Design an enzyme around this catalytic site. Structure first.
Site, PDB file in Angstrom:
ATOM      1  N   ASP A  80     -18.328   4.379   9.095  1.00  0.00           N
ATOM      2  CA  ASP A  80     -18.594   4.150   7.679  1.00  0.00           C
ATOM      3  C   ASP A  80     -18.319   2.698   7.316  1.00  0.00           C
ATOM      4  O   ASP A  80     -17.628   2.399   6.336  1.00  0.00           O
ATOM      5  CB  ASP A  80     -17.778   5.099   6.804  1.00  0.00           C
ATOM      6  N   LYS A 103       0.846  -1.183   0.000  1.00  0.00           N
ATOM      7  CA  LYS A 103       0.000   0.000   0.000  1.00  0.00           C
ATOM      8  C   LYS A 103       0.885   1.237   0.000  1.00  0.00           C
ATOM      9  O   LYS A 103       1.685   1.432   0.922  1.00  0.00           O
ATOM     10  CB  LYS A 103      -0.927   0.009   1.218  1.00  0.00           C
TER      11      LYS A 103
END
Lengths: 324, 51, 61, 178
Positions: A204, A115
């Site tokens: 979320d 990442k």
RNA sequence: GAAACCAAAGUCUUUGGGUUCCGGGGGGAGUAUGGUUGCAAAGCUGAAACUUAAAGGAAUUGACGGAAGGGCACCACCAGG
């Protein structure tokens, strides 16, 4: 890719040390603080600008070089290779505007994920906030893997880059049919109960963030935004996540819910919401450090010696002579 | 007395030995810096080049 | 306990995005308690409100 | 009925004489108190009467006139009459740091700055009023605001330049949920 | 007077009232050595080799502020479509 591996490390780390104090780094500072080779560093910087490693900057008086995104990525990858973590690159690109996913393979050949935080005032704030985001994300992955949550195993990190455990799969959105919705749904509320028990509420918690490892395992990522349960809005986020999962399951798979957990249980688990007596050798080392300090000051004040102004003055004098 | 006086003279003797030690450290550092400066000067004069 | 209200004077616009209106409130309990409150949405001089709780006072000073 | 007497210095006689009506009008209209200025003892004396509206208004009047005498403007102590939570911390400049002679004077200078501007700058950040007597500093404001102003002033008279003082006091005002 | 400034830092190329100390581009370096004083700490006197094209003093404008205030925009936001 990289071919020569001698002095791009030192020059680029000198550029990194220059970026830590100011915007645009002159070459004098680079030559002063990277002193292993002298004189040839100008052609080294000339070789770096042919790639997107560094960039020149000469507007009206300021004259320097700055680090680009690709140079910072190669710096992190070189630091990973110094740790013997990455040998070859797998080109399965997960192209996101907030992060780039590159497959890596070590000397053993075992594939891991990489990442690279790309965040999108100039780009020094972008790189610094990418570093901070990578640091807090690595801390969150370490905490979640220490608390036995179904997340990959963290491996390594270098300044924006995260070498992370590789699990193949697809996100829950683009899996059209699930053979066993009830079992994975009950496991989903089990994970919700576990997260709420661990003093944490997602806010979320989306199905797109849930990756179906062979439609059998749940993979969870992307925690920069992770908030506390001490907030008064925590149960509103928790109920929003619960209703989001519920409406997704009664809307997409046509499966109706059977268990309805509405529990706020804090904090029965770990509170992750915060998360000639002196020997002559020393005398020699100290005197060597001193003399290197004076010679570094001398190198700074010698390398700090604008030829564009002299060229313009010569051109102005020549034009005044040839026009009058 | 004979206890406070002993404590005070023990502190005085400790300070005297400490000053002797500090003076020895200063002279050793000065001598080593001088010989290293001589070596740096010899480097400046000869054994500096390509061939 | 729910108490009725009245708008006496609109004072200004407060909030981060200028979404709230700071207003003065007169009571319909026959009292002269003019308390400065914060409301959301369009209010004009002469509007009537419904307060869930009255013991809270808005951001004064 | 009870009364309070407060003294006045020699240098504060003329501002008391000029602003006299602006002093005694809110004392006698809104608070309903009797007031006089004893010239022999040079004391402003305020007493309660039968038509005083409520208790603790005499202390409001005493705070008003004492704040005016210390050097604050008449409006800045009318603020003491109206508002409840306003206090007065005062301290000597030589309290936090032993200063002698000219050095001490320079400390006074960097409380004022050029044109008083630095002082006014603190009055914009801490939302207070500050009065400089010859070796003394008086702050009028809310409790956290008084503490903020006191930290700023003590930072000024320990040698720190005004730029660091402005930056620190603005950061503290930013974290103060104002 | 290079000026900030200075009734002295004035009566200086129209240069001489008496007299003491003391400076000679920046470093090396107030260092080494020697002498002397001191219980010591150290004080006083005090280089050279070498290195360097500069170091500084006064003022004059203001890119850039991580300095502060105002104003404007659905190619900014708020409430929405």
């Amino acid at each position: 890719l990289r071919y020569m591996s001698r002095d791009d490390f030192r020059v680029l780390t000198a550029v990194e040390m220059g970026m830590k104090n100011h915007e645009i780094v002159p070459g004098s500072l680079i030559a002063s603080i990277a002193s292993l080779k002298h004189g040839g560093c100008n052609k080294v910087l000339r070789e770096l600008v042919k790639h997107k490693l560094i960039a020149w900057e000469r507007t009206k008086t300021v004259q320097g070089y700055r680090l680009t995104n690709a140079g910072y990525d190669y710096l992190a990858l070189k630091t990973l290779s110094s740790r013997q973590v990455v040998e070859s690159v797998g080109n399965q690109m997960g192209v996101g505007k907030e992060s780039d996913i590159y497959i890596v393979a070590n000397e053993e050949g075992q594939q891991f994920a990489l990442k690279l935080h790309r965040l999108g005032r100039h780009n020094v704030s972008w790189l610094y906030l990418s570093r901070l985001s990578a640091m807090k994300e690595f801390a969150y992955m370490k905490a979640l893997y220490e608390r036995k949550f179904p997340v990959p195993k963290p491996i390594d990190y270098n300044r924006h880059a995260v070498v992370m455990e590789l699990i193949n799969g697809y996100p829950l959105c683009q899996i059209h049919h699930v053979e066993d919705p009830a079992s994975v749904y009950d496991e989903a509320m089990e994970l919700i109960v576990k997260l709420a028990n661990h003093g944490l509420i997602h806010g979320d918690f989306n199905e797109f963030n849930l990756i179906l490892d062979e439609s059998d395992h749940i993979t969870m990522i992307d925690f920069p935004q992770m908030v506390s349960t001490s907030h008064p809005n925590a149960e509103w986020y928790f109920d929003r996540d619960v209703k989001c999962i519920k409406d997704f399951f009664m809307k997409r798979f046509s499966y109706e819910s059977e268990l309805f957990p509405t529990f706020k249980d804090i904090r029965r688990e770990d509170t992750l919401d915060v998360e000639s007596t002196i020997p002559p050798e020393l005398v020699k080392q100290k005197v060597k450090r001193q003399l290197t300090k004076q010679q570094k000051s001398a190198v700074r004040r010698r390398l700090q010696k604008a030829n564009i102004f002299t060229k313009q003055r010569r051109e102005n004098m020549q034009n005044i002579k040839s026009s009058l | 007395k004979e206890d406070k006086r002993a404590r005070k003279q023990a502190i005085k003797e400790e300070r005297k030995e400490r000053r002797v030690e500090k003076k020895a450290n200063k002279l050793a550092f000065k001598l080593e810096k001088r010989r290293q400066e001589k070596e740096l000067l010899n480097l400046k004069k000869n054994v500096e080049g390509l061939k | 306990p729910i108490k009725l209200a009245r708008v006496t004077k609109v004072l200004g616009r407060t909030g981060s995005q200028g979404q709230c209106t700071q207003v003065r409130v007169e009571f319909m309990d026959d009292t002269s308690r003019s308390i400065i409150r914060n409301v959301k949405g369009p209010v004009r001089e002469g509007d009537v409100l419904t307060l869930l709780e009255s013991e809270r006072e808005a951001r004064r000073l | 009925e009870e009364t309070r007497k407060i003294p006045v210095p020699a240098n504060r006689y003329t501002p008391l004489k000029e602003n006299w009506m602006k002093i005694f009008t809110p004392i006698v209209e809104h608070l309903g108190l009797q007031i006089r200025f004893n010239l022999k003892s040079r004391n402003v004396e305020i007493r309660t009467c039968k038509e005083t509206k409520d208790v603790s208004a005499l202390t409001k009047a005493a705070d008003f006139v004492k704040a005016f005498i210390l050097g604050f403007q008449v409006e800045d102590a009318l603020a003491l009459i109206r508002l409840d939570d306003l206090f007065l911390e005062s301290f000597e400049i030589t309290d936090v740091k032993p200063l002698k002679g000219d050095h001490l004077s320079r400390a006074i200078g960097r409380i004022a700055g050029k044109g008083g501007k630095t002082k006014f700058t603190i009055e914009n950040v801490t939302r207070t009023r500050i009065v400089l007597a010859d070796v003394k500093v008086h702050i009028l404001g809310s409790f956290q605001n008084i503490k903020m102003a006191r930290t700023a002033i003590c930072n000024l008279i320990l040698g720190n330049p005004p730029s660091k003082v402005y930056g620190n006091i603005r950061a503290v005002a930013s974290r103060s949920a104002d």
